[PDB]
Scaffold this active site. Structure first.
Site, PDB file in Angstrom:
ATOM      1  N   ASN A  49       7.019   8.301  -0.823  1.00 29.18           N
ATOM      2  CA  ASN A  49       6.793   7.867   0.566  1.00 29.18           C
ATOM      3  C   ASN A  49       7.133   6.384   0.735  1.00 29.18           C
ATOM      4  O   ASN A  49       6.907   5.609  -0.193  1.00 29.18           O
ATOM      5  CB  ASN A  49       5.321   8.105   0.912  1.00 29.18           C
ATOM      6  N   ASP A 105       6.168   6.669  -7.140  1.00 30.27           N
ATOM      7  CA  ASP A 105       5.311   6.936  -5.972  1.00 30.27           C
ATOM      8  C   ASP A 105       4.951   8.436  -5.948  1.00 30.27           C
ATOM      9  O   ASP A 105       4.535   8.992  -6.972  1.00 30.27           O
ATOM     10  CB  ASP A 105       6.070   6.453  -4.708  1.00 30.27           C
ATOM     11  N   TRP A 106       5.116   9.096  -4.809  1.00 30.51           N
ATOM     12  CA  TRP A 106       4.889  10.539  -4.734  1.00 30.51           C
ATOM     13  C   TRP A 106       5.855  11.346  -5.556  1.00 30.51           C
ATOM     14  O   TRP A 106       5.539  12.459  -5.987  1.00 30.51           O
ATOM     15  CB  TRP A 106       4.843  10.987  -3.282  1.00 30.51           C
ATOM     16  N   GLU A 118       5.650   2.342 -10.886  1.00 31.42           N
ATOM     17  CA  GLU A 118       4.806   2.312  -9.683  1.00 31.42           C
ATOM     18  C   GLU A 118       4.403   3.732  -9.279  1.00 31.42           C
ATOM     19  O   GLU A 118       4.704   4.214  -8.171  1.00 31.42           O
ATOM     20  CB  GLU A 118       5.498   1.538  -8.554  1.00 31.42           C
ATOM     21  N   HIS A 133       5.769  -2.846  -5.000  1.00 35.87           N
ATOM     22  CA  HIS A 133       5.742  -1.380  -5.085  1.00 35.87           C
ATOM     23  C   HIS A 133       7.098  -0.725  -5.110  1.00 35.87           C
ATOM     24  O   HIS A 133       7.393   0.055  -6.017  1.00 35.87           O
ATOM     25  CB  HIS A 133       4.861  -0.754  -4.010  1.00 35.87           C
TER      26      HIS A 133
HETATM   27 CL   LIG Z   1       1.375   7.325   0.358  1.00 38.00          CL
END
Ligand SMILES: [Cl-]
Ligand SMILES: [Ca+2]
Ligand SMILES: [Cl-]
Length: 294
Positions: free
Chosen positions: A37, A107-108, A131, A271
């Site tokens: 995301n 992330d995701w 990350e 990030h």
């Molecule tokens: Cl998120």
């Protein structure tokens, strides 16, 4: 180098009655790059070139993101982790990846990739991550400066913030990149999300799915499962740490630093570190793959 140009040509494939978009360049065993995301395959555009000639370079757009179809009808119950996984599992099956896959995740993309790897361990040659959600977390483990905002996402306030005002794309994304983005770069990131309302639902459903303080229970269980597995798996790993970093710091990082057979390097970034240090990241992944594929 940096640059706003995408890598390769976007391809399309029908999955569960929807069209999903992806990049697929070159031949051999896949190096599979998964965004989270609120990004898309575009995230990897300056990283993937470093792996040229080392394998089949693949980057998929998650459902409702990048150039992949929106779910219709979209709503508060759509774009859960479980739903994303159904689509991504089916896409990865359709792509005929073989049994020596290198995963590169963020992330995701890391929740999805770590879970897929646990469920397909025999097919995973190596895992590169950065990350990433390394385990289920507590609020104390989540970056202090973003606690209030993510708590707001995970409240009734979330629809106005995200569907109406596109806060994840327009605020969180540049807020967690150290260098200023160009007009063309932000245009590429905002393109799937130009329209207010449900077009932006994936960028709100995601923060609502982060396994924090036991909720949502299903994603907590999935992350608990892959956390235990990764802490014991002898599959080679590359941990790309970031400075100052963001999510993968403190206890989250303390934990993944216990994982076996792991190489670590540190690069500049918060990030979305792909936008700050793409060449250092690409060089590290390429070196990792070369060692895996002598
Ligand atoms: Cl998120
Ligand atoms: Ca910034
Ligand atoms: Cl083979």
């Amino acid at each position: 180098s940096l640059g706003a140009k995408p890598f390769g040509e976007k391809k399309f494939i029908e999955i569960k009655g929807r069209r999903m978009a992806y990049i697929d360049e070159g031949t051999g065993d896949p190096i599979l790059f998964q965004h989270g995301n609120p990004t898309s395959s575009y995230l990897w555009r300056n990283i993937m070139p470093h792996c040229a000639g080392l394998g089949r370079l693949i980057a998929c757009d998650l459902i409702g993101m990048g150039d992949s179809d929106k779910l219709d009808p979209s709503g508060p119950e759509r774009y859960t982790y479980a739903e994303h996984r159904d689509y991504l599992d089916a896409l990865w099956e359709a792509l005929d990846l073989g049994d020596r896959v290198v995963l590169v995740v963020h992330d995701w993309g890391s929740v999805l990739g770590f879970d897929w790897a646990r469920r397909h361990r025999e097919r995973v040659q190596g895992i590169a991550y950065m990350e990433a959600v390394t385990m289920p977390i507590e609020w104390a483990d989540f970056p202090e400066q973003d606690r209030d905002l993510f708590q707001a996402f995970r409240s009734q306030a979330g629809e106005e913030l995200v569907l109406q005002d596109n806060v994840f794309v327009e605020q969180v994304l540049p807020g967690l990149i150290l260098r200023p983005l160009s007009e063309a770069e932000m245009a590429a990131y905002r393109e799937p999300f130009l329209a207010a309302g449900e077009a932006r639902r994936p960028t709100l459903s995601w923060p609502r799915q982060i396994p924090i303080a036991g909720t949502p229970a299903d994603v907590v269980a999935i992350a608990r499962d892959y956390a235990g597995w990764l802490s014991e798996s002898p599959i080679p790993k590359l941990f790309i740490n970031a400075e100052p970093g963001h999510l993968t710091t403190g206890r989250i990082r303390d934990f993944c630093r216990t994982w076996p057979n792991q190489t670590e390097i540190t690069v500049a970034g918060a990030h979305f570190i792909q936008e700050d240090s793409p060449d250092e990241i690409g060089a590290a992944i390429a070196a990792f793959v070369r060692r895996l594929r002598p």
